Tab-separated table of C-alpha atoms and ligand atoms in Angstrom:
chain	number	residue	atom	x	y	z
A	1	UNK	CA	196.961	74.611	3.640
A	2	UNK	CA	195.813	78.191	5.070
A	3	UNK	CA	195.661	81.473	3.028
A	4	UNK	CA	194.525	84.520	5.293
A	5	UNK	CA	194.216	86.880	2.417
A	6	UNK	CA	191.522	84.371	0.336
A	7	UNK	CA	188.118	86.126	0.444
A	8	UNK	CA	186.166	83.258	1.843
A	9	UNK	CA	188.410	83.238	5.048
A	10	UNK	CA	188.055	87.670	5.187
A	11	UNK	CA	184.131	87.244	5.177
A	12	UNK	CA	183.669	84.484	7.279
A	13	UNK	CA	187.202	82.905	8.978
A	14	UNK	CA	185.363	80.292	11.750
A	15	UNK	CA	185.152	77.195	9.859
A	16	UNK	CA	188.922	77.688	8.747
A	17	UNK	CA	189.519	78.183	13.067
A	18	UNK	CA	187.922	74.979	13.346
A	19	UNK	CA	190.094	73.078	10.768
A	20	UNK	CA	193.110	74.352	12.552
A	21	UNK	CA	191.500	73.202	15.679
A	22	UNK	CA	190.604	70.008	15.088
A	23	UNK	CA	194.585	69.614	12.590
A	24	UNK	CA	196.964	70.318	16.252
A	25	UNK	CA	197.453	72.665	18.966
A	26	UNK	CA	200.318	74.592	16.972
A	27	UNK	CA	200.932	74.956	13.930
A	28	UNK	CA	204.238	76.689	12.144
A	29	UNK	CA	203.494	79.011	9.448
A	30	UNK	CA	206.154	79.437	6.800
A	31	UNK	CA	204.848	83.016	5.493
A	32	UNK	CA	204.563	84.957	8.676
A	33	UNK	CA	207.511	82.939	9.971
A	34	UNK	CA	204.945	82.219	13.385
A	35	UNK	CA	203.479	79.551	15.090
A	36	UNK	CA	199.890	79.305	15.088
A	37	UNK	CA	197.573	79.129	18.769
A	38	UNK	CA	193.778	78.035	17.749
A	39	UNK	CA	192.347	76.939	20.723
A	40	UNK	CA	191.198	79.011	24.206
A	41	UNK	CA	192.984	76.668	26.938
A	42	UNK	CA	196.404	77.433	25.091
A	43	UNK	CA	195.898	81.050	23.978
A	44	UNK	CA	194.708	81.447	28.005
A	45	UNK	CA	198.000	79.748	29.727
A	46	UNK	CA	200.663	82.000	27.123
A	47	UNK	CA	199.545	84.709	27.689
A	48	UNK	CA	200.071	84.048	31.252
A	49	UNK	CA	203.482	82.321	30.347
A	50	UNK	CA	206.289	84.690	32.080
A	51	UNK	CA	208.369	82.906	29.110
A	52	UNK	CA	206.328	84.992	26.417
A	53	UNK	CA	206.427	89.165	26.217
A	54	UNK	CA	205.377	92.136	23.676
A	55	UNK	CA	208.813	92.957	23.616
A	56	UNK	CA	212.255	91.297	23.913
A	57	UNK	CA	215.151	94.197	24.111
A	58	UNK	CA	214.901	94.428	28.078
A	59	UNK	CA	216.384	90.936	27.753
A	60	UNK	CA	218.180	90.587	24.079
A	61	UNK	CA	220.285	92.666	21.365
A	62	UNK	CA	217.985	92.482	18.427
A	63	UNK	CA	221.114	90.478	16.699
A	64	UNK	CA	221.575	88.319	19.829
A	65	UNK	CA	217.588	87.726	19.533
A	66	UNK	CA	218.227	86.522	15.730
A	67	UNK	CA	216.460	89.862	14.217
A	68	UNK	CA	217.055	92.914	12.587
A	69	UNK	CA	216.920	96.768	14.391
A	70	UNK	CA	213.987	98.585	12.829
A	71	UNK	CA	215.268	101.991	10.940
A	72	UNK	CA	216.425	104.802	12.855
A	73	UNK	CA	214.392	107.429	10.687
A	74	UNK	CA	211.306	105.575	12.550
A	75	UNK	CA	212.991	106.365	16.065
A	76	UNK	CA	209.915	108.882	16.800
A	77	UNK	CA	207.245	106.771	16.313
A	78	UNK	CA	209.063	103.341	18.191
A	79	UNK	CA	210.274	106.196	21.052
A	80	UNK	CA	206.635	106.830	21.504
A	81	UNK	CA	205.448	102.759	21.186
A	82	UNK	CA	207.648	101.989	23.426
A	83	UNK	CA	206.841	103.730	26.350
A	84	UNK	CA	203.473	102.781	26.151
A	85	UNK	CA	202.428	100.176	28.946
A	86	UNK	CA	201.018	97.583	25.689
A	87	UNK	CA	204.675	97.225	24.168
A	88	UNK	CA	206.939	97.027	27.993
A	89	UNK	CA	207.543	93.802	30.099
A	90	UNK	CA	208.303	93.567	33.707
A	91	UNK	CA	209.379	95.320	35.996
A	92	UNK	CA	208.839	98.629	33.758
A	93	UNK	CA	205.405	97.030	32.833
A	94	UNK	CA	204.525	96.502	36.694
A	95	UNK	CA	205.478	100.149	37.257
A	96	UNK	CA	203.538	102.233	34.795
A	97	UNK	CA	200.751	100.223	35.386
A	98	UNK	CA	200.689	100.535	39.120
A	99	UNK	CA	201.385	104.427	38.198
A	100	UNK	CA	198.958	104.846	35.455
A	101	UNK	CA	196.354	102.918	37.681
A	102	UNK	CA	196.319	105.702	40.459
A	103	UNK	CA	195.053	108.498	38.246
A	104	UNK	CA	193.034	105.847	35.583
A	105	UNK	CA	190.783	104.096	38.462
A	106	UNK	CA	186.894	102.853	38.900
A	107	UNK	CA	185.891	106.197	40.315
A	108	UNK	CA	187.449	107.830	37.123
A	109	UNK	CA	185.104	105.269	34.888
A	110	UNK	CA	181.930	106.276	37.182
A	111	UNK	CA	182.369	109.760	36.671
A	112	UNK	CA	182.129	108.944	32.502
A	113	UNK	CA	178.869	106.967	32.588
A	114	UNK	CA	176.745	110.427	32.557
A	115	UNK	CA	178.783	111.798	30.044
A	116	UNK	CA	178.930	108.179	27.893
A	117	UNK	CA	174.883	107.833	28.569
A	118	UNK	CA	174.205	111.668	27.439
A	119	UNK	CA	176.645	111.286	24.141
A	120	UNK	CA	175.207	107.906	23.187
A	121	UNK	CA	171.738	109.715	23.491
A	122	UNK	CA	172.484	112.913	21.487
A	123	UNK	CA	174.542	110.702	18.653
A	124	UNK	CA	171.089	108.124	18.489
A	125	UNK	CA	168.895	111.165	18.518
A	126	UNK	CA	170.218	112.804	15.665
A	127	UNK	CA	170.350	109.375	13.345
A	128	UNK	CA	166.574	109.147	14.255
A	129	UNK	CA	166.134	112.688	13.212
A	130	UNK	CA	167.866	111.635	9.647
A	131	UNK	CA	165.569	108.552	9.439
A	132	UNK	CA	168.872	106.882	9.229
A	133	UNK	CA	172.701	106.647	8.224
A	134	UNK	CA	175.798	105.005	8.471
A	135	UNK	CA	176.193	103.347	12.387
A	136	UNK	CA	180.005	103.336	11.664
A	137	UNK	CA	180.643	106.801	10.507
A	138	UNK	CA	177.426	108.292	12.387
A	139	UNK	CA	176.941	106.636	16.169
A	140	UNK	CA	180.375	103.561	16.612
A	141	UNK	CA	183.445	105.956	15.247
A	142	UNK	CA	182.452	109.543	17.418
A	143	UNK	CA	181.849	108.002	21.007
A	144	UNK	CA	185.041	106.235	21.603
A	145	UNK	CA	187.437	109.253	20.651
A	146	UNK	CA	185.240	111.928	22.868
A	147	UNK	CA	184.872	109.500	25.813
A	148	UNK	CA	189.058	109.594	25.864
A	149	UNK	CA	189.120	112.892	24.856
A	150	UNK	CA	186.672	113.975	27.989
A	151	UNK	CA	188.789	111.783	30.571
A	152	UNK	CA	191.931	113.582	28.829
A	153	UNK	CA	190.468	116.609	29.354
A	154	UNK	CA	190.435	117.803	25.549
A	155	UNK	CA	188.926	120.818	24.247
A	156	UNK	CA	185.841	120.101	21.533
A	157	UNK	CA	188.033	123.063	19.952
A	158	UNK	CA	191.235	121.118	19.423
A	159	UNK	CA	189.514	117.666	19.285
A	160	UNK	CA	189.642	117.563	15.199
A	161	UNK	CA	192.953	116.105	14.471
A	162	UNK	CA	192.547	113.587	17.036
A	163	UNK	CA	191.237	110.926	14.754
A	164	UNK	CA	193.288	111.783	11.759
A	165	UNK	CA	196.536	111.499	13.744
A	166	UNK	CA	195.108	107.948	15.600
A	167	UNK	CA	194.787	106.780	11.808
A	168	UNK	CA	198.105	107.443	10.470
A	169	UNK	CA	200.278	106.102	13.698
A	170	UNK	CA	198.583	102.968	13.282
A	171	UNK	CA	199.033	103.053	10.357
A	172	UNK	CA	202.602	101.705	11.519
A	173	UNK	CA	200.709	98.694	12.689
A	174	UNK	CA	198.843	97.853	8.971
A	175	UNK	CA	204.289	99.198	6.190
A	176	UNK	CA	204.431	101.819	3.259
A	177	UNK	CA	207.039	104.111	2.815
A	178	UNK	CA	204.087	106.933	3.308
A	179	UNK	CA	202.436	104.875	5.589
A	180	UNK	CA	205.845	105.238	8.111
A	181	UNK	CA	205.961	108.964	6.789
A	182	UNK	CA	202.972	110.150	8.249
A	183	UNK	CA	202.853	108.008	11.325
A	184	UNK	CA	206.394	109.269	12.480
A	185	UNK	CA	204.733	113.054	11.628
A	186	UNK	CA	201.580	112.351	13.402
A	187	UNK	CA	203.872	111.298	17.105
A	188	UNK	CA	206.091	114.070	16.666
A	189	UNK	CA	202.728	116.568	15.939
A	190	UNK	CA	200.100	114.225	18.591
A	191	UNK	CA	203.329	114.225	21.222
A	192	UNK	CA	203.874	118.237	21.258
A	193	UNK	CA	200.341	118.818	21.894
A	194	UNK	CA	199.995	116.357	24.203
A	195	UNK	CA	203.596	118.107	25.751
A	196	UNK	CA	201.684	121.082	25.613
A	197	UNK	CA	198.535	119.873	27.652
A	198	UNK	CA	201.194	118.091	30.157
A	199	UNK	CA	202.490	121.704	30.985
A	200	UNK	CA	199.579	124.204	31.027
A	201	UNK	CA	198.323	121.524	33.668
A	202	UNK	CA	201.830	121.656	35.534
A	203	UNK	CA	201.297	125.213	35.752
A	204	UNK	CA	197.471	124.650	36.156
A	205	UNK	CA	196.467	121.571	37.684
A	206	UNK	CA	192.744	120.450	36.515
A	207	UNK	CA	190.776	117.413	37.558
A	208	UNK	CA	191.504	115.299	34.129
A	209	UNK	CA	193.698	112.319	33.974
A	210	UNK	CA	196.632	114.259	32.417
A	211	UNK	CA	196.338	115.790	35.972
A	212	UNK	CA	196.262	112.855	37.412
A	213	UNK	CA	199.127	111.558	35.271
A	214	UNK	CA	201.650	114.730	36.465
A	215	UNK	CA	200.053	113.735	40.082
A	216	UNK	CA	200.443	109.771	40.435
A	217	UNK	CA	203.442	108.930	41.965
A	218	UNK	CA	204.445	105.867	44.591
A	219	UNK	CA	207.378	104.822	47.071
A	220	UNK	CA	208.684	108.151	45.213
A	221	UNK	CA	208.220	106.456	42.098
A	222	UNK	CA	207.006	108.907	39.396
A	223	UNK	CA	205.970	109.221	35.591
A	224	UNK	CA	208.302	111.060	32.485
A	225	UNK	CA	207.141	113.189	30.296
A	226	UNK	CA	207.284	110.238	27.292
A	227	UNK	CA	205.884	108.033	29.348
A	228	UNK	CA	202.616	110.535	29.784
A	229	UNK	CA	202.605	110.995	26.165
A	230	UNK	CA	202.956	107.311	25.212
A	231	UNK	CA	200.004	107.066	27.774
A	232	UNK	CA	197.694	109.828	26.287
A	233	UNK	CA	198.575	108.058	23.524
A	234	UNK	CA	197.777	104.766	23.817
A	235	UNK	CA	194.627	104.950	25.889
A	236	UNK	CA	193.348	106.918	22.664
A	237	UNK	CA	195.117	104.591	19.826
A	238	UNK	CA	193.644	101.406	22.178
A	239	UNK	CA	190.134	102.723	23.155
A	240	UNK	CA	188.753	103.657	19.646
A	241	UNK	CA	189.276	101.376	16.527
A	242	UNK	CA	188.608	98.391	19.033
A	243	UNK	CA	185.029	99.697	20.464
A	244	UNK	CA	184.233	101.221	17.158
A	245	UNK	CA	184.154	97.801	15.347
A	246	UNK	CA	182.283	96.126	18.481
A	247	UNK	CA	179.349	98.181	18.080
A	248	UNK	CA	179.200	97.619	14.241
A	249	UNK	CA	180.235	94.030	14.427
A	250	UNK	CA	177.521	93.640	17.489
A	251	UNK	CA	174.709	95.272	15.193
A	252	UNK	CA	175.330	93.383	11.809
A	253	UNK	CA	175.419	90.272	13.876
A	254	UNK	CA	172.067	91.339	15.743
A	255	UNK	CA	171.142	91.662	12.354
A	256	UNK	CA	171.755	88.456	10.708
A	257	UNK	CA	170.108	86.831	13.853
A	258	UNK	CA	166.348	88.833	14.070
A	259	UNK	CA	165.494	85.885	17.048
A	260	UNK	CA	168.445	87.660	19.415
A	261	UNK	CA	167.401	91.026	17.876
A	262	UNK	CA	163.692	90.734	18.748
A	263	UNK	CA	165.322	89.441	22.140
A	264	UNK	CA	166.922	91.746	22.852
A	265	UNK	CA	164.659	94.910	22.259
A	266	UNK	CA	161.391	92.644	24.434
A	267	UNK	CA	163.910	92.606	27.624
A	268	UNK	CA	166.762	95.453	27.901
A	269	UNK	CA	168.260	93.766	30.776
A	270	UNK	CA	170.130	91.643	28.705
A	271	UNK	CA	172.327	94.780	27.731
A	272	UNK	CA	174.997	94.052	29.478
A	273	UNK	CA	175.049	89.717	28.616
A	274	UNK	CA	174.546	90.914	25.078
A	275	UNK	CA	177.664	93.144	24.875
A	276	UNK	CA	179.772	90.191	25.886
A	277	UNK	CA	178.107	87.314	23.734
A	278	UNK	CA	178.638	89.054	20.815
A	279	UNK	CA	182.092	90.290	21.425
A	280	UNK	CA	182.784	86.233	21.698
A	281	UNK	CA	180.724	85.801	18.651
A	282	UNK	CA	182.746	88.105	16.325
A	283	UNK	CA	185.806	90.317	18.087
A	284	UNK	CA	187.337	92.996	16.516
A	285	UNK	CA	190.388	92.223	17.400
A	286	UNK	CA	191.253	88.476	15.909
A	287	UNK	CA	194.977	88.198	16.369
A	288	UNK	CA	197.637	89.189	18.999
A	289	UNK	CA	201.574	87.917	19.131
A	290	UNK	CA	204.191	87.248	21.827
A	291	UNK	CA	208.016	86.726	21.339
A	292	UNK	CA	209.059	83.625	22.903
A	293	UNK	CA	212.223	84.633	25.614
A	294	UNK	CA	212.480	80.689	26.642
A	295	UNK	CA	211.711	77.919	24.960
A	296	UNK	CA	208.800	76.596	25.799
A	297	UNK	CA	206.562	73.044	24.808
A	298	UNK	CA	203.428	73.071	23.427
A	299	UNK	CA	201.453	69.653	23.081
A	300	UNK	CA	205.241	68.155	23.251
A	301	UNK	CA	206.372	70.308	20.121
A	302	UNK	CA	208.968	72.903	21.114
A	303	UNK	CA	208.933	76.168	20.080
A	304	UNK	CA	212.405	77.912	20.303
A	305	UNK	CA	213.363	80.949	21.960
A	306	UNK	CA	213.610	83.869	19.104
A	307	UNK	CA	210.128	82.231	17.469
A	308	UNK	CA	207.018	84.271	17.225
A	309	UNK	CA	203.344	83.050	18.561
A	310	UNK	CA	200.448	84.469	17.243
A	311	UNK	CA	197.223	83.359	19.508
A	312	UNK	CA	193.740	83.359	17.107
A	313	UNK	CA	191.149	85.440	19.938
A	314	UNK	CA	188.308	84.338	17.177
A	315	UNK	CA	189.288	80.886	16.947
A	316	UNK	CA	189.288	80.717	21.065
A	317	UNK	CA	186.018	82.553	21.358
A	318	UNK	CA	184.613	79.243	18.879
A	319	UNK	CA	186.185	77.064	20.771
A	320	UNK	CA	183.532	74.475	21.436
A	321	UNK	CA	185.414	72.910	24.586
A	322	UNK	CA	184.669	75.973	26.458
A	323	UNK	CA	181.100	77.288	24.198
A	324	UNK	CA	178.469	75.388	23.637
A	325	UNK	CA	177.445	75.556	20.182
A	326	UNK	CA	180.250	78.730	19.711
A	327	UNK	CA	179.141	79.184	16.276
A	328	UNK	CA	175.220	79.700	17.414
A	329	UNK	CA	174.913	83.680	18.947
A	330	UNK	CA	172.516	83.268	21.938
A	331	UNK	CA	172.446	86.778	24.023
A	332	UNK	CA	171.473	84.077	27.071
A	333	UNK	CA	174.962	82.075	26.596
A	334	UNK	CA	175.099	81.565	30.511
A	335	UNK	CA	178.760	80.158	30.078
A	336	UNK	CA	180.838	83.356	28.107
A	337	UNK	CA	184.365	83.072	28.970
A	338	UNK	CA	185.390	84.621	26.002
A	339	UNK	CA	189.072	85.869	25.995
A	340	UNK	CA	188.464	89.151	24.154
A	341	UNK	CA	190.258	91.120	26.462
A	342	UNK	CA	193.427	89.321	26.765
A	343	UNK	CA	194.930	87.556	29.948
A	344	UNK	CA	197.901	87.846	31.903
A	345	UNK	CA	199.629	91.466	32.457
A	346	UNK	CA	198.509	92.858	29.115
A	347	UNK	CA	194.773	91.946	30.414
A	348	UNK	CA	192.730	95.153	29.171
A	349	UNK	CA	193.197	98.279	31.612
A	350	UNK	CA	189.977	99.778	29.654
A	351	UNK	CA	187.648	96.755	30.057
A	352	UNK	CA	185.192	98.598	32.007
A	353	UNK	CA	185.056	101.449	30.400
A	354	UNK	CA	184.734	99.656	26.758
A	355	UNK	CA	182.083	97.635	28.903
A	356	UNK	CA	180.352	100.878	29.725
A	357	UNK	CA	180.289	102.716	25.890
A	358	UNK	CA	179.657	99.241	24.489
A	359	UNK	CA	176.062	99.225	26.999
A	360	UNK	CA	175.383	102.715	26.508
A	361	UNK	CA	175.573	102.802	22.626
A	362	UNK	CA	173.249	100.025	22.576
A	363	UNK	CA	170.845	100.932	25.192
A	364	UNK	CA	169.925	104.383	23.449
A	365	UNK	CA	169.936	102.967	20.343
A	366	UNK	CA	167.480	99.768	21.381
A	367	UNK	CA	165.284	102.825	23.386
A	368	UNK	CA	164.987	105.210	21.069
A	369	UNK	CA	165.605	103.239	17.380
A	370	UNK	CA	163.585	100.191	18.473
A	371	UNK	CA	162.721	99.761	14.609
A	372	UNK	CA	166.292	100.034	12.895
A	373	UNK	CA	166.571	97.710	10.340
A	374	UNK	CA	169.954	96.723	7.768
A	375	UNK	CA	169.154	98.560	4.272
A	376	UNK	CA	172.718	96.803	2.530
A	377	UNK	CA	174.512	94.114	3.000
A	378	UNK	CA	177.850	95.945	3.934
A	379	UNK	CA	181.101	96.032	2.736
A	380	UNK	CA	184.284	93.625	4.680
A	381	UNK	CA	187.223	95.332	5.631
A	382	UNK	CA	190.465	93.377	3.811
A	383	UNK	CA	192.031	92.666	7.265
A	384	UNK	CA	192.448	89.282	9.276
A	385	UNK	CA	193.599	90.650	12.309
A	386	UNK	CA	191.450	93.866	13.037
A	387	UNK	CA	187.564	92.877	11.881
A	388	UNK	CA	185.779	95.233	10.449
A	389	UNK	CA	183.320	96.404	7.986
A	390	UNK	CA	183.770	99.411	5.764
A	391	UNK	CA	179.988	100.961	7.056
A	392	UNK	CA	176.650	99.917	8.304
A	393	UNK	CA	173.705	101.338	6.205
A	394	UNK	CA	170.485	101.496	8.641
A	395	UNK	CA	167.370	103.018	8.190
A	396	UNK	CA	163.929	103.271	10.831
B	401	HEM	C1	186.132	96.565	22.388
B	401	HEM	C2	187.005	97.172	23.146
B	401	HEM	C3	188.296	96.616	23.530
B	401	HEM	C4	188.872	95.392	23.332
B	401	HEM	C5	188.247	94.166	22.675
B	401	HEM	C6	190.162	95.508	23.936
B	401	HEM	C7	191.071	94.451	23.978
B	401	HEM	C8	192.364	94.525	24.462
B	401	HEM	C9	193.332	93.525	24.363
B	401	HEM	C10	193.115	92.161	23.746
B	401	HEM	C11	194.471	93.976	24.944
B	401	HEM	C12	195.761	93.189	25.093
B	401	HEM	C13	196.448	92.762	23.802
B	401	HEM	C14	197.522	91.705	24.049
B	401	HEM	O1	197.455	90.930	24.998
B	401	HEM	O2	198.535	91.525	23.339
B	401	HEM	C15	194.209	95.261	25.382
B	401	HEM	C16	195.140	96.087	26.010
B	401	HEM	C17	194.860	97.396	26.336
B	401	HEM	N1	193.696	98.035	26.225
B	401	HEM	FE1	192.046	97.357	25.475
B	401	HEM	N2	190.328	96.704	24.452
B	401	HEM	C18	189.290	97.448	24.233
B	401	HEM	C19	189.018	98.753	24.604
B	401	HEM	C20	189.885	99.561	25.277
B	401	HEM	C21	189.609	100.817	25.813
B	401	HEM	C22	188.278	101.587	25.718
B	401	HEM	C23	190.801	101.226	26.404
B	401	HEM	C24	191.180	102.467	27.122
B	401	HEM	C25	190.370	103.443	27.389
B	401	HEM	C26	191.747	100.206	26.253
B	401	HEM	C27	193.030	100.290	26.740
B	401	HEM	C28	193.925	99.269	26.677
B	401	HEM	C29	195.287	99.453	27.217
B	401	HEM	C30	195.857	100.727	27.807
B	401	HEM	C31	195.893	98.264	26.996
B	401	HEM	C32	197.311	97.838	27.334
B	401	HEM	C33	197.292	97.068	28.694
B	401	HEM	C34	198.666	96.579	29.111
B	401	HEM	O3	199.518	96.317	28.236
B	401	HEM	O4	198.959	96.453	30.331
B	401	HEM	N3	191.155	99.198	25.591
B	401	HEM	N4	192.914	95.605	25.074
């Protein structure tokens, strides 16, 4: 008896969670054809299943997998997907991580945190100056981009398109015929520039990560061009829309609980708690899916190899055998294992860097907006699976 689409569920989707807690464990769901995974023990052990994977074709023929081959005319975008670390399984998985892991490392996130802290400044700074704005459009939406951008090692000159082209590949993801239209363009057009950049630094080696990409190599294992471009790529597609709606999701919730706001802004070293309590509280990112390569038993009901699992992130971040009181946001939850960043391989390579802008965002904006206040109610996103509103309307 569940209806994603029905408006109640959009707005506020945590009592429904609960229902399909407390009804099983899985649950089969005729319209998506997939099996639904409520609660955070089981959405923790399959995505550490070796039995489960992002992709299935570097084991099965679509048709001996029981499915259908997507359309050639898309083979530019799916070229580009799938040499991006998100959509491989082992071994290829284990080796563009390992690769991609010797030019993206911790020292490469400490070098941001000056550039993150001055950007979050400047971006708080000049909403102050306004006496206000939109937090989406204004301070969430420009950090994330330039932060990638910077580690790329992007010109502010060709930085523009950037966004535009992010939108329309993933737009893939949300499929009109335009939608697939522009999102094969926008790979072809993102994947030359990014070629581009890849041989200027061949040529001329810099000290960005594209330079570190050309660089990283092990037992005389090495990167492709594709699989540099599907990285570029994909650290930009998965480091923006993600961060962008945890900042606005974080400040509407601050600001439907004044008791964790007021909190918050009397003792600045909860920061860092703060980020992560309400990331559990409200994600952005409510739904991810696994093929099932074996069949595998869940709660004694098998699910057959071929079948799709999608795990519910916001139903396992309310799940009150691991939170007390999930549905209560407390910026002191001592006990916050919330699984917002995935587990197993696909576990988040950007955690602490999202960590870092999510801190940084909210520090300036607690130091020097300590009186923001909510001037509308805002406006939901239609979406069940990325959470979002269309704007935040703030004023000091
Ligand atoms: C609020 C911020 C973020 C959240 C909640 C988030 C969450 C996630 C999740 C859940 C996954 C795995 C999805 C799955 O298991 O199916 C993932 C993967 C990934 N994330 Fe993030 N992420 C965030 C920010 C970022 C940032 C800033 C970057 C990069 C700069 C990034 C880069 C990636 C990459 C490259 C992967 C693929 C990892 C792999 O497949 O091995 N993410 N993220």
């Amino acid at each position: 008896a569940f209806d994603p689409w029905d408006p109640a569920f959009l707005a506020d989707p945590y009592p429904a969670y609960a229902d399909l807690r407390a009804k099983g464990r899985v649950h089969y769901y005729e319209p998506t054809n997939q099996w639904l995974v409520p609660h955070h023990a089981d959405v923790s052990a399959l995505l550490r299943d070796r039995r489960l994977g992002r992709a299935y074709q570097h084991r099965y023929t679509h048709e001996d997998f029981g499915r259908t081959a997507p359309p050639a005319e898309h083979e530019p975008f799916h070229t580009l997907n799938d040499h991006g670390m998100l959509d491989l399984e082992p071994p290829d998985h284990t080796r563009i991580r390992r690769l991609v892991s010797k030019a993206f490392t911790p020292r490469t996130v400490e070098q941001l945190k000056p550039y993150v802290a001055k950007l979050a400044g400047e971006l708080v700074d000049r909403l102050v100056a306004a006496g206000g704005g939109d937090l989406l459009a204004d301070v969430a939406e420009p950090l994330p981009v330039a932060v990638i951008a910077e580690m790329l090692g992007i010109p502010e000159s060709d930085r523009a398109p950037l966004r535009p082209w992010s939108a329309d590949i993933c737009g893939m993801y949300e499929p009109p015929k335009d939608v697939a239209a522009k999102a094969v363009r926008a790979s072809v057009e993102f994947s030359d520039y990014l070629r581009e950049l890849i041989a200027e630094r061949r040529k001329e080696p810099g000290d960005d990560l594209i330079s570190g990409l050309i660089a990283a190599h092990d037992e005389g294992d090495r990167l492709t061009e594709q699989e540099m471009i599907s990285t570029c790529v994909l650290l930009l597609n998965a480091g923006h829309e993600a961060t962008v709606n945890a900042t606005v999701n974080g400040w509407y919730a601050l600001f439907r609980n004044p008791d964790q706001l007021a909190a918050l802004r009397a003792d600045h070293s909860l920061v860092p708690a703060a980020v992560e309590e309400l990331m559990r509280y409200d994600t952005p990112l409510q739904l991810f899916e696994r093929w099932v390569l074996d069949e595998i038993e869940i709660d004694g009901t098998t699910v057959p190899r071929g079948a799709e699992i999608a795990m519910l992130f916001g139903s396992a971040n309310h799940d009150p055998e691991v939170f007390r009181n999930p549905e209560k946001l407390d910026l002191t939850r001592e006990d916050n294992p919330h699984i917002s960043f995935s587990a197993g391989i696909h576990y988040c390579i950007g955690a602490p860097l999202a960590r870092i802008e999510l801190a940084a965002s909210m520090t300036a904006l607690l130091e020097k907006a300590p009186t923001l206040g909510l001037v509308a109610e805002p406006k939901r996103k239609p979406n069940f699976v990325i959470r979002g509103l269309e704007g935040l309307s703030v004023a000091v």
